[PDB]
Amino acid sequence: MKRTYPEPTPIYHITHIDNLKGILRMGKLLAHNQSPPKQRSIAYAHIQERRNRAKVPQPPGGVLHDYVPFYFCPRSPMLYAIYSGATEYQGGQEPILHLVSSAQAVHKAGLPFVFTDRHGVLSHARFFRQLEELAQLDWEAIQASYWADPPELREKKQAAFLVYKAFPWALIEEIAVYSQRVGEEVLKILKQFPEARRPRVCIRKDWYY
DNA sequence: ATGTC
Numbered sequence: 252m253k254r255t256y257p258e259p260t261p262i263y264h265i266t267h268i269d270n271l272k273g274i275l276r277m278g279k280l281l282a283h284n285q286s287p288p289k290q291r292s293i294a295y296a297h298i299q300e301r302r303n304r305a306k307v308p309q310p311p312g313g314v315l316h317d318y319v320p321f322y323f324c325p326r327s328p329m330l331y332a333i334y335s336g337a338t339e340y341q342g343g344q345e346p347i348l349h350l351v352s353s354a355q356a357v358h359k360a361g362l363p364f365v366f367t368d369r370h371g372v373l374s375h376a377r378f379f380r381q382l383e384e385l386a387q388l389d390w391e392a393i394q395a396s397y398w399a400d401p402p403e404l405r406e407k408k409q410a411a412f413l414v415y416k417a418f419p420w421a422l423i424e425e426i427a428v429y430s431q432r433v434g435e436e437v438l439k440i441l442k443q444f445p446e447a448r449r450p451r452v453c454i455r456k457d458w459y460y
Numbered sequence: 461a462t463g464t465c
């Protein structure tokens with residue numbers, strides 16, 4: 252019998268540790284089109300250019316770059332490309348944070364969101380607004396440790412949770428890290444912003460390659 | 461195993 256979604260339903264945003272000061276200084280993740288003060292890009296430029304022009308067909312509309320992106324799993328295919336040094340970024344996985352929240356927290360906060368059933372740049376991706384439609388996602392695919400094939404599993408592992416324009420730091424519940432050295436550095440950065448929520452910092456080597 | 465398509 253096919254797996255269901257946990258409730259609350261965790262959502263994950265990966266970013267380089269060099270960006271955490273900018274996230275705390277703004278008090279939020281900003282969408283790409285909101286010009287976040289990022290220090291370190293870990294993206295593929297050629298797929299960023301697709302996101303730059305990919306329409307979001309549910310309200311509040313706009314394009315994929317108008318939304319702060321999350322996945323429904325850690326240990327993403329994106330993180331594999333970073334781990335293997337396939338990106339322009341050559342620093343590897345160790346300085347990449349997993350920022351964790353939930354779908355339900357976003358809804359309760361009244362923030363506009365959409366989600367997809369597969370990688371959002373695919374022309375056949377379905378888009379949803381109602382958390383009951385989390386039943387449309389493939390939770391086997393989302394949880395799969397081996398995702399390279401078959402193709403439908405590879406697409407559906409990359410179902411995305413999309414928050415319009417900005418995501419408030421106070422909705423982050425956990426920062427997951429690869430190593431003790433990165434966890435310590437995360438805590439030093441948080442202590443420079445004493446008015447900000449300090450989520451638990453957890454070493455989760457099984458969220459990495 | 462997996463170099464986001």
Ligand SMILES: NC(=O)c1cccnc1
Pocket residue numbers: 263264265266320321322329411
């Ligand atoms: N940076 C990310 O975690 C992310 C999540 C979903 C899609 N693209 C990027």
